[PDB]
Amino acid sequence: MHAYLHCLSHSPLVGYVDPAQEVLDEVNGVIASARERIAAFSPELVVLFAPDHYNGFFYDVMPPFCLGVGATAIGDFGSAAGELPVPVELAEACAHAVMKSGIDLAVSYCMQVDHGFAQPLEFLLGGLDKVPVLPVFINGVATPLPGFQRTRMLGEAIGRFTSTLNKRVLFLGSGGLSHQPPVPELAKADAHMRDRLLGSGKDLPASERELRQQRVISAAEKFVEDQRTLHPLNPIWDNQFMTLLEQGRIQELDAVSNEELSAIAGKSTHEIKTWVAAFAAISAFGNWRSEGRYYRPIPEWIAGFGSLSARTEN
Amino acid sequence: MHAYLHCLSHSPLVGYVDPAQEVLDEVNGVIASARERIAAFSPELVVLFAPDHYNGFFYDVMPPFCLGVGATAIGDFGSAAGELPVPVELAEACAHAVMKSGIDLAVSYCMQVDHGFAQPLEFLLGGLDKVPVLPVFINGVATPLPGFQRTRMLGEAIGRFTSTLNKRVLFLGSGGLSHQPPVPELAKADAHMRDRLLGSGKDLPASERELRQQRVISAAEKFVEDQRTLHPLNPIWDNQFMTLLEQGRIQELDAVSNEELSAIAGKSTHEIKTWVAAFAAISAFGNWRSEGRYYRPIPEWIAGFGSLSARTEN
Amino acid sequence: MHAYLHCLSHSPLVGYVDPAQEVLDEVNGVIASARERIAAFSPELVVLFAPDHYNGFFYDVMPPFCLGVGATAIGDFGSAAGELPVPVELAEACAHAVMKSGIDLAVSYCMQVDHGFAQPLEFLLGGLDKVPVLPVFINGVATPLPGFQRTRMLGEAIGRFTSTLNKRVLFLGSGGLSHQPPVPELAKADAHMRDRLLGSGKDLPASERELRQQRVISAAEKFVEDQRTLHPLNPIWDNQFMTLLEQGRIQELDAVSNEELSAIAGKSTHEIKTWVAAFAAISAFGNWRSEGRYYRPIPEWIAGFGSLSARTEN
Amino acid sequence: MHAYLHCLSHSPLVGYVDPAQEVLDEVNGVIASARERIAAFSPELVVLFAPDHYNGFFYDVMPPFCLGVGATAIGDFGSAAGELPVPVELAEACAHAVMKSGIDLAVSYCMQVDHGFAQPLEFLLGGLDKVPVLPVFINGVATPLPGFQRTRMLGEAIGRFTSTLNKRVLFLGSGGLSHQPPVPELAKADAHMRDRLLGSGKDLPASERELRQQRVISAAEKFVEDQRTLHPLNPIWDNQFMTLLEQGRIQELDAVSNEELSAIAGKSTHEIKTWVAAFAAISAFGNWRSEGRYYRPIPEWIAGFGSLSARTEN
Amino acid sequence: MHAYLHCLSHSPLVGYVDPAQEVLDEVNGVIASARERIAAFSPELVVLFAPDHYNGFFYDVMPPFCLGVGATAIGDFGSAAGELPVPVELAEACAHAVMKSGIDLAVSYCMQVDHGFAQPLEFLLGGLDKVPVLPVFINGVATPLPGFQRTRMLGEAIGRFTSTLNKRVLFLGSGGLSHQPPVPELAKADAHMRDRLLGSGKDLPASERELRQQRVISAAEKFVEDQRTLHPLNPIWDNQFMTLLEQGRIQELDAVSNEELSAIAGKSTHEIKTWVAAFAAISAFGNWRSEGRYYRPIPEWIAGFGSLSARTEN
Amino acid sequence: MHAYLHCLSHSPLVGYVDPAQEVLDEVNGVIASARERIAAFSPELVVLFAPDHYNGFFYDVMPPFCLGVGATAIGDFGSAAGELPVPVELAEACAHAVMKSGIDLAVSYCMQVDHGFAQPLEFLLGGLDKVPVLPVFINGVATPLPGFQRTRMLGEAIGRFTSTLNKRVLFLGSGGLSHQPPVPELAKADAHMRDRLLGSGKDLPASERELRQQRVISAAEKFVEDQRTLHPLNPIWDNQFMTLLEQGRIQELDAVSNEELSAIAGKSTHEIKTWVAAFAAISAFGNWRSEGRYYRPIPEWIAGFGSLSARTEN
Ligand SMILES: O=C(O)CCc1cccc(O)c1O
Ligand SMILES: O=C(O)CCc1cccc(O)c1O
Ligand SMILES: O=C(O)CCc1cccc(O)c1O
Ligand SMILES: O=C(O)CCc1cccc(O)c1O
Ligand SMILES: O=C(O)CCc1cccc(O)c1O
Ligand SMILES: O=C(O)CCc1cccc(O)c1O
Ligand SMILES: [Fe+2]
Ligand SMILES: [Fe+2]
Ligand SMILES: [Fe+2]
Numbered sequence A, B, C, D, E, F: 001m002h003a004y005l006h007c008l009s010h011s012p013l014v015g016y017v018d019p020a021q022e023v024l025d026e027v028n029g030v031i032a033s034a035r036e037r038i039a040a041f042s043p044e045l046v047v048l049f050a051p052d053h054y055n056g057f058f059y060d061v062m063p064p065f066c067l068g069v070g071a072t073a074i075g076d077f078g079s080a081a082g083e084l085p086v087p088v089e090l091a092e093a094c095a096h097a098v099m100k101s102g103i104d105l106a107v108s109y110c111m112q113v114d115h116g117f118a119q120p121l122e123f124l125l126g127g128l129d130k131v132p133v134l135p136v137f138i139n140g141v142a143t144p145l146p147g148f149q150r151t152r153m154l155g156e157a158i159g160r161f162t163s164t165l166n167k168r169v170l171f172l173g174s175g176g177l178s179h180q181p182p183v184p185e186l187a188k189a190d191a192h193m194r195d196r197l198l199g200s201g202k203d204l205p206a207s208e209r210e211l212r213q214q215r216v217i218s219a220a221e222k223f224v225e226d227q228r229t230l231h232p233l234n235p236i237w238d239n240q241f242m243t244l245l246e247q248g249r250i251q252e253l254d255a256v257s258n259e260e261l262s263a264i265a266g267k268s269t270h271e272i273k274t275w276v277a278a279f280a281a282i283s284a285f286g287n288w289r290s291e292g293r294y295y296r297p298i299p300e301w302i303a304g305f306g307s308l309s310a311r312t313e314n
């Protein structure tokens, strides 16, 4: 049993809005060091937990968890576009095993994914089509949302399935740490906005995409001007969460509720559920130890950047 | 705290293919007696569990369980076409409660339902828009499928939520008994039928609907000629299942697996999961007793007709 | 959920060797009263546990338990000869359920049965082809033999399966109470005797059957002259066994071993295992009460005659 | 106490149908290395678990487990023929102990065996009459079939008995990995085929044997042409099963059912039950360590070749 | 299950030494009433627990418990002399069952009993040869002695055996209440009395018997003159013991030790162990209630007279 | 605390009937090596468990266990005769402690013992009066017999008492392995034989002793001619028993019953109970390890010779 884990924040505003050059150099160095460690590990399988940003999943059918037997990246915000290499038979076996373990898992054969899925693959693996990948979508924007306990159990089931494959497995978490970007909501929407939310938004014209990107960039700039326009960053909770993950106290997160998390840190903080899943997976491989802890509140981007790694000790 | 339950088989081939007049009169009398009992009960809320037949849910996103905040009937096979009356606030509260209870439940705001949802409402309530209804979708045709234990806990969570509303609740199960009609499969499909299965089946033209209905009718006639063209009916297992449901021994169904059920009775027998859910729900209201048991193997229709009712003992 | 049980000793020496006319009249009256009670009960299914006397099973393959999907009577010792009516689908379902329950059960599609199966059917039901029957063979002559605990678990599994059929079930036990008649053994056999024991004895010529019957009759007459030629009868143990069965203390028989039983009462006493199975079966139907207890040591026949009945107090 | 274990796939199509010379040399080298390790171990007793292919056991009496006190190999598919050296007293003691342990075990004194029993003895020991052997037949072709839990407990009981003999014991599992060759069935049989299935097929004339062998060879050639004529091989499940066996997680196989295994891998995959039994046996001797893992999907033969070994560490 | 119990003090000094006529009439009336109740009960079997007074058991072999398969009365102190009717087969079955239950029981085929056995049979049944009897000897004079817990277990085992005989059983306890008459001891013995104690006391000449009886009578007269020549009577402890027996609190006697009992009440008080056994036996038959309590300290005899009865509640 | 244990088979036919000289030399060498180890240990106390052969205990009183406060060897079959050195105070303390521990132990002050007691003392210690000895008689010829569990508890109680004496204790088991010599029985006896069995056989005349010895010698010679005149030897069960004793798995013998042991190995095999007791005793002293295992089936003597030793690892 050999396993590697790396959790990293993703940000669509790379190049569009930039911090000081020293911060960018430090972030790039951290990412390069993580990539070097991953390349040294030389994985054979990748399991990628990621959220969506109203690009592939809508309110026509909104599942808490989804597994992508076939996935294609649409290439938004400058990210790569194209079809992902997914082993069909292995994915179907994983779906059967997780369904049998007691997890109600949705299955998709044509899953459109966005920068949340594509960016970690480019940054850490070098491309989309390097290593076979199992994509797992976790809902984080549309209420009701899954809890910490169900996410932990999903991660444990996936890790228990993957521990019997006699392969070197790399686990990835793509969610952010703490931020509150302007995200469309169903309750306060208008007619056109409701129509876009209830599906029919997969084939968005380029003009609407440009308008959405411009709105996100402008909101980010206003956040740089002042953090009270959105929910302000919470470094204390981010550090507590990372420390809890490293100390092997993941189960202590079962006491935190969804509304409590939203009040403390913000509505988008739920992306961190991906991280939780990843860590649960590695707990199935035996004893492990962490490394490469990095955190920094970057106001130029909306989120607070974080990165962590773990390795199974054999 | 008052509760009623009625589980009844649904058959699209009512009038298209007919058995002898005597059995038709007997079935109509049983249905009329059940309708009279329901009208005497005078429910205030309806919770309906029903499957789909590749008309509203496809392989783009296939969840095990779904809740319909908004549902519209498509009027296939001569069934009623119209929009179902769903209380939005109650549906959202139910979704939140079931998610918190530990069930991974999908949510849809524009859910297209087939004759499986429409026919019981016409037959027992008298129309689509008589009583407010909470539509619950359970997958029964696309593998992997949910098990008996997860369906039982879904029913228990829904019943636990509804027991606190201070209303008279009627529970319905629309699934049929053991049968095996021709159903398209993803593995053995061709290009066109793979394309229809993955999606684009919501906007199905009328010519394809006519061809599908004609093929179903022809297969039913061949089944009447000989039962070996499909999986033959299994009265023994149907009677065992009904007896287990009546005796309050629902948990004994947790030992039966999906492949075992498919081998014993047929692939479509999984529709009976709806029945299980319904019974679990009534178990949350306290003591109950059953009545109106009826079963008969009708070869003219593909399925074996069944009907059962239960009432809480206040 | 209704059940009846009747256990009765069988004796091939009816008419060949006879006791006084008074005791014969008493036995016939007891049998007639039991038949009247059974006819009043009006059963729908019969589960018959009976042993074999080296007539259908041999040392080519000797199982501890066997289920007969197809059975045919050979008409030995003046008993009826013919084919038993066995429901094939019900028998196969029973075999599947008992196998799944954790009992290693053998199945046979062509089972030859001696007077042990035929005589109770004639005496209690009126004929071989009156009611559908499930024949269950329990080994009692060829070591190693099954214990009391495994026989009890087999009976419990069969009763648990049959309690969900929504029928009226009659359970029968056909073994004797206490005796040790001359039975061929493998250890002390000669060449021809060994050849007959290891199979090849199914199609026995009539001359060998006549010689066997004459030897049994002569041994019975010598036993009438003196009981020390064989193992003497043990009324105390027979009464203890019957009392234990009536008081619902069947599990107390798990402490008794096979060699202890053989030493106390005789090698053939193991036939009573059938009785145990029958009683275990009725324990699956709920509360029951016993009746019709009769015991008498008849030295003219080899065994000690006994009879008992039980009814579910619905 | 010291013990050795070796599980190896068997294939009647050795020489009749051949793959490339390189893979044949590789398989021969693996077999030779296993034989060398066994010869170095120098065992004193062999316990051989094996299936049958409708040559020794039929539907006259079909047990789930059988122990051969006397066994003779018939010599089919070019395998060796003749009497097997079985210690009678040791076999009878083993039967008594296993019966007392709570396993319903059949006993045979003239057991006709086939290439499934003979081929491993020739390949790994050098001949049929080298070391005393206890043959254990496990049913794998005729439904209903024993489960994984019952097979595990049978192996545990046999190992517990053999751990007190003060001998060096070698355990063998002759079953193959996932495959599905054409095998006659009872449900779809004709009159002559049913007559052959319900016994009377022990003394098959050479013409019928030639026809059966030719049909098997032709089916193998068609499978080489295309794998969809039968159930295609499943390397994923084979590797999962081997990894589960090596990691000491045999109990996890109790959750898998018979119909689930048949659907996932094929009807003949049940032969792997023999492997399970073998491993359970070694768990009775204390701590053990595995070695010699080899797997390769050979399409030229029907099965997927596998081999594994284990040793008690002292 | 029908059971009766009667415990009564025995005294060899009836007629030899007499109290006032009124108390003699009262004792005779109590005994007559108990005899009338026993005759009304009409028992079928008698189990008699009685002690010995160095007349049948000596230091050659001294067991704590003994069962008499054959017993003969010697007729001392004017008691009846003769052979007791003991069912041999029933006694042997009882011995086997009690030994299997976990009690280390001795057996004797020629047991010489004394007035302790004979007197209750004459007084309560009318003679020695009226009803079949199972004689059980409990040691009470030779140290080391059995405790209360082992005596209770012996009584429970005997009652559990006798509850399956389908007979009406009468239990008797012949031990007396608190007293301490002159009893020879091994430690303080001289040569001749050491020789008599170890053995040769069975064929005791009549002159030694006369001397022993005269010594007992003289000691009784001196005790009448003053109670300090022996251990004085303890009415308080006798009443506590009887109250504990009636209230079903027999287990509370497990805390009392042998030396504590000897110090509190006297060395001969250990005879009451018989009473304990009797009561334990009736606890095996179900619910029971006591009656006929009588106690009186008679100084003219050495012991303190007591009598108690119990009846099962059918 | 320090403890030694040695169990050795005894045989009265030493010199009267002899095997080959090599076998005799090997047996003498094994015995001499055991004697040397015992002499090196230098014990201070000996506890000797032994059976009787109808020489000291008869059916007048037959206890399951007996402790000899005073013992005398009668000198049969050429063994030594005379008084044994027994510490009276220590023996009485042991009797009190064992009685208090919950074992129903008989006590004798004049115990006549035979070659079963005398021969191990001569062979292993050098004489009868070398070391103080506690003799414990265990019944093994007269039914009913004590079981394995009660014998184990007796051994544990004795070891627990002796572990507090601050001495070096040697434990001996004088019983023999599987065999069945001609032994008089009560059931099949005649008038004179019954009279001798029910006592009166202590002071046997020399002529009857000569006749008994001659009959035993003749039966041994016939057994040498053929082993079927008695029960044939069972090396398999003997080796299993020795292996179970060495592996510390003594409690596994609680499942074996008396009749099962008699059927498997023979009536006299019950002598091995002594061995069990011895081993139980050493388990009270802490951790121990075994040595000096020797077994050989000697047909010239009736029994199968065995020898084993163990020491406490301080
Ligand atoms: O694609 C979109 O709609 C924007 C999503 C988005 C916005 C701000 C910060 C983020 O980290 C982020 O993922
Ligand atoms: O609507 C469809 O697509 C056909 C569904 C369907 C087909 C056959 C038998 C049925 O009972 C059934 O519901
Ligand atoms: O049927 C046979 O083959 C003879 C068996 C048999 C022999 C003796 C006494 C019996 O009661 C009995 O059934
Ligand atoms: O011996 C027979 O009857 C054929 C059995 C058989 C057939 C195909 C592939 C196999 O691996 C196999 O064992
Ligand atoms: O029977 C004998 O040998 C004398 C026994 C004895 C002595 C004194 C008081 C008694 O109550 C008693 O029973
Ligand atoms: O001592 C006696 O009276 C004979 C006992 C005896 C007889 C045969 C074989 C033995 O091993 C044995 O101990
Ligand atoms: Fe994000
Ligand atoms: Fe349907
Ligand atoms: Fe019989």
Ligand SMILES: [Fe+2]
Residues within 6 Å of the ligand: D010, D176, D271
């Ligand atoms: Fe095979």
Ligand SMILES: [Fe+2]
Residues within 6 Å of the ligand: E010, E176, E271
């Ligand atoms: Fe007394």
Ligand SMILES: [Fe+2]
Residues within 6 Å of the ligand: F010, F176, F271
């Ligand atoms: Fe002996």
